[PDB]
Amino acid sequence: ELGNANFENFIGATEGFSEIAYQFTSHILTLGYAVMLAGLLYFILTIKNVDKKFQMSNILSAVVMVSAFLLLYAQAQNWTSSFTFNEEVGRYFLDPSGDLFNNGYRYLNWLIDVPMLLFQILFVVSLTTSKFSSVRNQFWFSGAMMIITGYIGQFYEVSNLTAFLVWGAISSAFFFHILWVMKKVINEGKEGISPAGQKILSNIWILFLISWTLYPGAYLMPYLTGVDGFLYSEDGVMARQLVYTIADVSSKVIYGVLLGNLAITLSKN
Amino acid sequence: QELGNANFENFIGATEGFSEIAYQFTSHILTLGYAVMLAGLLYFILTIKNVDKKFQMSNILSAVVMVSAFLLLYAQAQNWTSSFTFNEEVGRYFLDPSGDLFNNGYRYLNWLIDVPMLLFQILFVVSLTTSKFSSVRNQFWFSGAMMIITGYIGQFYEVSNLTAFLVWGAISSAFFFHILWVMKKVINEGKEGISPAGQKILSNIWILFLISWTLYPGAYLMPYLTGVDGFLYSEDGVMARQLVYTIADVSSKVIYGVLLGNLAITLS
Amino acid sequence: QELGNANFENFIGATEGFSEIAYQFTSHILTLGYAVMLAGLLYFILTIKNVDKKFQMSNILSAVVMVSAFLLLYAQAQNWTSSFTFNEEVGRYFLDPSGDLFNNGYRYLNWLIDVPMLLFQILFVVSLTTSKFSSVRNQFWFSGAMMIITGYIGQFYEVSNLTAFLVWGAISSAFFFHILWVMKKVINEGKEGISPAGQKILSNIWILFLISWTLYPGAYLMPYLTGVDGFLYSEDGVMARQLVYTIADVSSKVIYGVLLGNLAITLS
Amino acid sequence: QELGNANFENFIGATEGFSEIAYQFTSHILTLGYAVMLAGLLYFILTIKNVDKKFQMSNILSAVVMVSAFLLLYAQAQNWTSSFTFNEEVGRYFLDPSGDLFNNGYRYLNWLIDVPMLLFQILFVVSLTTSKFSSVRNQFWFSGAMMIITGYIGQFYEVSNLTAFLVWGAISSAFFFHILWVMKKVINEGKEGISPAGQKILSNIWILFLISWTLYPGAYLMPYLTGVDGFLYSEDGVMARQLVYTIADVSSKVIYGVLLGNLAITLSK
Amino acid sequence: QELGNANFENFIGATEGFSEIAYQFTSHILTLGYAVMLAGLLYFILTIKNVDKKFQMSNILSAVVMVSAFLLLYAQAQNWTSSFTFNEEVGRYFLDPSGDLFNNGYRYLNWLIDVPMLLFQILFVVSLTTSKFSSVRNQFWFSGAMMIITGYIGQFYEVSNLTAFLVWGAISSAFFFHILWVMKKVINEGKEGISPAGQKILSNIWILFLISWTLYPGAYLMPYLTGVDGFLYSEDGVMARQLVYTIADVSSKVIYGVLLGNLAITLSK
Ligand SMILES: *C/C=C(C)/C=C/C=C(C)/C=C/C1=C(C)CCCC1(C)C
Ligand SMILES: *C/C=C(C)/C=C/C=C(C)/C=C/C1=C(C)CCCC1(C)C
Ligand SMILES: *C/C=C(C)/C=C/C=C(C)/C=C/C1=C(C)CCCC1(C)C
């Protein structure tokens, strides 16, 4: 009996994980947190490369880096502690002494990441029709609602599929609102800047859309091939954590780097 | 099973145990706490040069509080996860004494850093008018120390001796009310003779201070806010206590420091 | 149960065990200690540029002492929590030999950083008149080293051999008195030719130094301050010893450095 | 006992076990590795201001690589010490599955940081002539990623499936050769129009790059460099592999960065 | 039972075990060591700007050495405490093989950082007269590497094979004497043409170097300095060895760097 636990624990407790699955998941989480610490150093060391008015972006990027490093390190340790090798069959099985594995660790830490990532672009682009404070408030409210509803949802991904899907849809509504507001922000930011900055802003928009869409994908991952599908397996576990790592790097580090490049081009010198 | 003067989390964990949701949520919220504290440390260090020299002591004290809070919340998260272990037969997390009993006192003693400094730093932004700096500082520090120490004594008896728990809590509340009085005076005097933007920021600071600080005795009382054998005397109350702690920590420390920095900026 | 030349904390833990309150309080006070030390490190680094170049060596040495103290107190907190484990049947923490016996000697050898540097750093703020810098430094360093090493040898015998314990303590006390004399001379000469505010700060520094440094032999003698089989030869004495250690640490290091910084500011 | 797709260190440790010398030396060499990486981090940060502004990006990228390498090598040292435990009866260290299986893949995924950045940073010191910056960078990044991913897949089968091991290794070697080609081009173009001292520094950089990077497929092949049941299919091969890894890491990262810094100094004014 | 090529600390711990005083003292001295190293790191960073630009590299190298030493000593402290565990029945700490055997080799490989850098950094303060910079550097580095490697091989056999122990020690001692010769020359040339205060500082540095560096072969020989079954082949010898290591480390690294900084100050304007 596992109750309201993530599906990684069910797979680990019934079939277990092959060497490749367990080792790969550990490797990808380690890569994640190492990327976050390296990004922290990068964003600190390049602060003085942009005009004063843009440096708040670098600062917020560093804040996000700290959050992500700490969380991903904890999550890597959680993964390696929750599953242990069984010599008889050569697979890693659920070790309850390590606690059940739970992805929710990320969700609450998104309560840092999402507000800040949405916030920092407002320190680079200049709005035209929209009010700064109103856009910020909309970002923050919709982000909080999205994160909390998805957090509740993911606890039931095995024990109660209906709650899982309903909470996911409720979260998706706020997600769509966030996408709308960000589209407005980028469009207004394009107005009245050099074509190079406009190209950077278009790249930022594409990056934002794809990387942020990856997260509900990881949310749904075990069921993307339906019940007892190919992905309801260790393959799905690997896929979920890989998608998480790609999304983390893209939405945080590369996003911050593109914002820094935009700040450089908009800066005098 | 004999637990003595232990927090009610240990009694819940030893009798009913914790569901996956309760245990995991508590771990998540404590992790969020310490991550917020370290991020705030970085923010306050990186923004020091944004204010006039005379105001930078506030940034420095914010960073000090951030260091204290990060260390404490990290240790407390590890304590939580070490004290409770999964029982596979029933699927619940039960008290694991090899990890030591869980105790909230870790927070309390670290408040001996946070409370004096948080109360101190506001005096580096506002200018007093009728009140003396040294007098306000000494009152803040004495009353904070007494509040913290009495509440610390109280919380050990929250299960073993409800009477001592409540008496120590009331004694602490007296010093708390004194602190609220002194802070109200400080905010009012700080409003005198400053720009309207600063006055709006100071009003916001007062409201934030009042609510966030009042949350702490709420967490203190949490297991009994629905009476004996109430709805909250359960894993729900454990979750609520740690949630309220995290909200109060973030609001009273990080947001407080940020608003103080904004006030310093407007006054520069 | 054979413990040999071990500190009395282990004997209390192996015979009576520790109640929840005693164990938890000791953990809390050691954690508070190391958190205070890290916060002090941050403060002293961030305030370096607040004083003239000639005084900044004091800030730097304060930071060095902070590093030493943080590392040592963190290690000691981990040692405390590893050495004693909960017994479910009776609800007390007993000696867990897999965690090693508890020993305060960790502090003593780390004083070989703290004591030379603390005594040294004051020579970068005050100006001597009749005394020679090098002579004062050398006397400070020799007497500190001898005091620390002899007390270190002594504390291993606080239970196994009371005679060696007391004899080594007295030998240490002689060098302690020599240090007190030299520090009195230094402070008196430092008062000569500076403003009255600096003189008041120096008087405060002297009082702080005397009390905080006297606290250490108090912790040394703590288990026997009520004689054999006294009230303090118990978990109460363990709590008192670590509490006195923490108060002395904070006072002699952080507050001492802060007062020195204020003196440097007034002299700048 | 069944180990599946595991590195040969696990098979040696589970069958013969490790003598004191082999186990201790491997631990020492991994510890030395991560210590060198953190020291290099400090050096590259402290010497940033020794070069003109335009060259400081090289210092920054060196520091990023140092962070990656430190984190990875520390984790790997802990993994080594966790996977093998002393057996009192015979005096050898045997596989301790409770510590998890030992796997070199930790280094491969972190190369996804190291290789792109190491190749990138030289473009902030040398000036290209006929080649385009973006094209060289894109080729570097794509070929490095493919090399790393194919070798990572390969190394899981070094015992369980020699054929897949060798096929994936060859595919990786192709991208390696492409990288060597592009780097030779970069060095040649960089030599044009700089002082003879800088040209000598660039020649040294080329030799260092070639040797240090070639050491890595050597470590890949190590257990079989003396054939089946050869001298190296033993604890000697395990220690030799980790030794080659550490030499290659230090040379390809720290000494590479130091030579680039010296080149930047000579080019500065 | 069978310990093989292990350090004598493990033999003492496995046969007689360690009393409370011996075990606790060794742990305390290792902790003191690494604390001193981290404090020195902070000191050397914070005082960089106290000397003229051309001398600041010395500060940097001191910081580099501090990092290495810190990491190594930290690891060694934990290693000590993991290798020996209290036996309740008799009240002594005995070898706990689950923690791994204790090995001093951790120090030796980290000297491959410490020894070259310590020898290198003095060349950034003193001016040579008859000797060539590159020649002195090359000789220092080669002879240091050989000394370290030969001593490292030797120390594994200090119990299992006394003959190899002494032969490798003597081979190391030859390179040690060469290093002493070259350093004496360097000090003599550095004294020429500087103020007498600087000359006195250099004399003090020479004395410090000679004594502190000679302490290391003393620790090498420690268990046998009173012959077979001597007073020092005991827990007293273990304590003495680690104490000598700590004194030598502090003197040869921290105090050495401080004296070099003082020399740089006196030569500065
Ligand atoms: C650094 C983290 C970032 C940018 C996180 C972004 C999160 C999302 C886009 C969340 C999406 C969710 C839904 C739209 C539906 C299901 C639940 C979520 C929380 C996964
Ligand atoms: C960052 C931490 C802060 C601001 C802590 C503030 C602490 C309090 C407001 C303490 C309150 C207490 C009482 C008023 C009554 C019951 C006991 C306490 C200690 C929880
Ligand atoms: C930060 C640490 C400081 C200032 C330590 C000071 C140490 C002492 C005052 C030592 C005192 C001792 C004696 C005078 C007698 C008994 C033994 C000692 C070592 C505790």
Ligand SMILES: *C/C=C(C)/C=C/C=C(C)/C=C/C1=C(C)CCCC1(C)C
């Ligand atoms: C700091 C790390 C660096 C520069 C790593 C470089 C990695 C390689 C040159 C990898 C090479 C490989 C092949 C050419 C063949 C076999 C598989 C690899 C991945 C080991």
Ligand SMILES: *C/C=C(C)/C=C/C=C(C)/C=C/C1=C(C)CCCC1(C)C
């Ligand atoms: C910080 C560490 C330093 C300066 C290390 C210095 C090392 C030595 C002087 C090495 C000495 C050795 C011999 C001369 C003979 C026996 C073997 C050694 C390796 C201990």
Ligand SMILES: CCCCCCCCCCCCCCCCCCCC
């Ligand atoms: C110049 C600085 C002046 C600082 C004055 C502030 C004083 C704060 C220290 C208060 C210490 C209170 C002591 C509490 C004793 C605890 C008794 C507990 C009773 C059970």
Ligand SMILES: CCCCCCCCCCCCCCCCCCCC
């Ligand atoms: C220029 C600096 C001159 C240094 C002055 C003296 C300060 C160093 C004193 C070192 C004291 C070491 C005492 C240890 C002796 C061993 C103790 C054995 C038991 C008594």
Ligand code: NA
């Ligand atoms: Na595991």
Ligand code: NA
């Ligand atoms: Na747990």
Ligand code: NA
């Ligand atoms: Na414990």
Ligand code: NA
């Ligand atoms: Na091991």
Ligand code: NA
């Ligand atoms: Na131990």
